[PDB]
């Protein structure tokens, strides 16, 4: 999931449904391949002993300073207008510096974001609508002009940018326990036999 070559844009973020398998989280925590790792409502050591019915792994790329806006009941541009975490979100957050892959000489505009929206996005909501944003009451009709702007904006990516603004690939796992039976569980032991 995190090893995938290309990730979707903050507005284009893909949602992967993971179920019916076993999950080993000790390799991700002890691999030291993540820049920052934090969980909400559940400890990392307890995940191995807990079975979850559905696990959603979010994928997208955001600015370094924008990672702080990912959390239950947060604010900001990326949180409200792009991706937001509900107050009850039990999942975890993972990020690492992509400046060695995504960022290239000349800049990479493939990763964009939604700058303006008429309101704040709802929890776990994805809107790809490219419709022009109307600031005032002046009609737009898809033609850029006064009080008419294009909401999507491209993240500037170059290796010479500061570490704070370096692109970080974030994988958000959504842990939700529903009435359906549980499948995904932690690893096993299988000690010696006597």
């Amino acid at each position: 999931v995190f090893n995938a070559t290309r990730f979707a844009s903050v507005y284009a973020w893909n949602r992967k449904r993971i179920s019916n398998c076993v999950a080993d989280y000790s390799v991700l925590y002890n691999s030291a391949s993540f820049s920052t790792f934090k969980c909400y409502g559940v400890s990392p050591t307890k995940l191995n002993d807990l079975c979850f019915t559905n696990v959603y792994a979010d994928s997208f790329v955001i600015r370094g300073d924008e990672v702080r806006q990912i959390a239950p009941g947060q604010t900001g541009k990326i949180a409200d207008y792009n991706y937001k975490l509900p107050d009850d979100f039990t999942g975890c957050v993972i990020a690492w510096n992509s400046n060695n892959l995504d960022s290239k000489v000349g800049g990479n505009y493939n990763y964009r974001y939604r700058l303006f929206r008429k309101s704040n996005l709802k929890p776990f909501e994805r809107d790809i609508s490219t419709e022009i944003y109307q600031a005032g009451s002046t009609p737009c009709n898809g033609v850029q002009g006064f009080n008419c702007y294009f909401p999507l904006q491209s993240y500037g990516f170059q290796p010479t940018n500061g570490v704070g603004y370096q692109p970080y690939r974030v994988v958000v796992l959504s842990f939700e326990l529903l009435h359906a039976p549980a499948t995904v569980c932690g690893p096993k032991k299988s000690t010696n036999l006597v």
């Binding site: 600031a135 009451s137 009080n147 500037g156 570490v163």
Partner: protein, 597 residues
């Protein structure tokens, strides 16, 4: 629905689009300065024009959001700069002809040269050629040939180009609803929108003129001392109550008197503090020079430098194949990318310059969180002022002995410090009169108070009264003295250097009160003191987003400029110069001339 929501929306989308084009424009200039190539020269013009035309396109939409309906102070400040149309207000001909005058005057400055009178074949350019020779030249005729002949083919030829620069720039200020072009530069200090902190543009002429009156007793004594040492060379041309020759100031324009520190040394029987021989034995390079300075900012609480900063630095010039400008400069592009381009040798000045060049970068890190339009110093004098306070702390014997440069047994007494204050006085006290003199003259010519024929008549008439300098060869209105100057020909603010002296000293006195240092001010050292850094960091991150009058109160507690810190830091030197001048006359007269007897 209200214009406020529409204004904030235009400002949010402007920072993103402007940050991408501004970063590429500055990045293009970096590759051009670090390496001279046909690809970088064109990239600087393309990237420079793309960003230059960006503000011109955004300015059209900025004038559609009046500031009368905006109740937010931070919003009006962002639109205050965008509301200006720049050269768009000028006519098509006056707008295109303006760039031709600036490029023509700037070209003659770099291409200007004075052929050696004794060697007509050899012709040396001003920089470095004419600036280096005039520094160490002790000859009266040798210094007069290059000083007098320069303005003949430059000052006289630049007069017609300067006249157009005066008429063209005035049309821009009038279209901006400004009294004149002189008031245009004073707008940087303009403060409005906050009750009680409002600062009028016209109040600058009174402040600079009121503060200069208190500097006279300090400069008069410093001038009488310099004239006494040089009086033995030419007693006929140098009068005791008269003025010193204009070409003997130590350089071309007499901006800094540091070059005269050699002959002006009060005590030659005592050693001087120099880290050149100490750094050589320590075997230090440009890599460890900046590293030692980075630890200084951490001692005061300021964050360290990012990894990319030290990795992308340029420590020297790899020969003529890839050439760069050795002029120290702090380049701030954007997106957290900070770099410095300088040629690093082993000297006592490079160590002090390292803290200055790093001060600009360290200063850009505090307000980096502010919007693009809100990223800047509170005025034009805070840019280099924040960097000088860092260098003044390194020049103190206490800081040098901490890292091990100066021997721990070095004796520090009056004789040792008196010689140090004189070296700093020539670079500080020497620029103040020259700054107020030249800056005030431009305001009078642009305002229309001095007819075109009196340009030179009022130049030297006000020079003997301000800096006390007389011209060896009288000049007519054809010559233009400021035309040859770097800042005057390049259309840069010349007032920022005057206020820098008052601002750097105010912070020096305020920061030392937080660190609880006792004794003379020049003995203060801000190293190892984390209390002074926390107080200065508050204003560092504010930038120009808040009125400079308000931000200055949170540091020194003053609502305007004051000369008090100038008298205390120079107090020990003033007490010594007052006694040495008892046998001479303190001050000068404007009725004496070298050619008038």
């Amino acid at each position: 629905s209200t214009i406020e929501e529409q204004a904030k929306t235009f400002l949010d989308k402007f920072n993103h689009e402007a940050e991408d084009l501004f970063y590429q424009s500055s990045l293009a200039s970096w590759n051009y300065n670090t390496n001279i190539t046909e690809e970088n020269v064109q990239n600087m013009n393309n990237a420079g024009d793309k960003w230059s035309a960006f503000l011109k396109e955004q300015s059209t939409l900025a004038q559609m959001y009046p500031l009368q309906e905006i109740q937010n102070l931070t919003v009006k400040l962002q639109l205050q700069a965008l509301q200006q149309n720049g050269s768009s207000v000028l006519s098509e001909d006056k707008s295109k002809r303006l760039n031709t005058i600036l490029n023509t005057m700037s070209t003659i400055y770099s291409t200007g040269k004075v052929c050696n009178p004794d060697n007509p074949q050899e012709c040396l350019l001003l920089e470095p050629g004419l600036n280096e020779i005039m520094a160490n030249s002790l000859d009266y005729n040798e210094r007069l040939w290059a000083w007098e002949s320069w303005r003949s083919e430059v000052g006289k030829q630049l007069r017609p180009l300067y006249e157009e620069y005066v008429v063209l720039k005035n049309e821009m200020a009038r279209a901006n609803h400004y009294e004149d072009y002189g008031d245009y530069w004073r707008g940087d200090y303009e403060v409005n929108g906050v009750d009680g902190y409002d600062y009028s543009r016209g109040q600058l002429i009174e402040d600079v003129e009121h503060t200069f009156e208190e500097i006279k007793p300090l400069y008069e004594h410093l001038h009488a001392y310099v004239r006494a040492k040089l009086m033995n060379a030419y007693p006929s041309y140098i009068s005791p109550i008269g003025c010193l020759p204009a070409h003997l100031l130590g350089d071309m324009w007499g901006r800094f008197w540091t070059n005269l520190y050699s002959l002006t040394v009060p005590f030659g029987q005592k050693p001087n503090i120099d880290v050149t021989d100490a750094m050589v034995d320590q075997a230090w390079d440009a890599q460890r020079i900046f590293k030692e300075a980075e630890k200084f900012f951490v001692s005061v609480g300021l964050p360290n430098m990012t990894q990319g900063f030290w990795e992308n630095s340029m420590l020297t010039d790899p020969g003529n194949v890839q050439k760069a400008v050795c002029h120290p400069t702090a380049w701030d592009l954007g997106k957290g990318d900070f770099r410095i381009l300088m040629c690093t040798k082993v000297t006592m000045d490079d160590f002090l310059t390292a803290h200055h060049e790093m001060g600009h970068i360290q200063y850009d890190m505090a307000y980096a969180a502010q919007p693009f339009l809100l990223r800047n110093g509170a005025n034009e004098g805070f840019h280099e002022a924040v960097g000088e306070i860092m260098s003044l702390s390194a020049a103190t014997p206490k800081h040098l002995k901490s890292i091990g440069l100066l021997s721990p047994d070095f004796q520090e007494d009056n004789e040792t410090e008196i010689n140090f204050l004189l070296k700093q006085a020539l670079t500080i006290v020497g620029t103040l009169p020259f700054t107020y003199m030249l800056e005030k003259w431009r305001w009078m010519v642009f305002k229309g108070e001095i007819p075109k024929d009196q340009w030179m008549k009022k130049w030297w008439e006000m020079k003997r009264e301000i800096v006390g300098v007389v011209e060896p060869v009288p000049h007519d209105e054809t010559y233009c003295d400021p035309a040859s100057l770097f800042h005057v020909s390049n259309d840069y603010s010349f007032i920022r250097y005057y206020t820098r002296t008052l601002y750097q000293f105010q912070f020096q006195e305020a920061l030392c009160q937080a660190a609880k240092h006792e004794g003379p001010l020049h003995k203060c050292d801000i190293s190892n003191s984390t209390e002074a850094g926390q107080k200065l960091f508050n204003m560092l991150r504010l930038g120009k987003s808040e009125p400079w009058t308000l931000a200055l109160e949170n540091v020194v507690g003053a609502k305007n400029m004051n000369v008090r810190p100038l008298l205390n830091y120079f107090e020990p030197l003033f007490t010594w110069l007052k006694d040495q001048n008892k046998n001479s006359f303190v001050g000068w007269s404007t009725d004496w001339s070298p050619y008038a007897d």
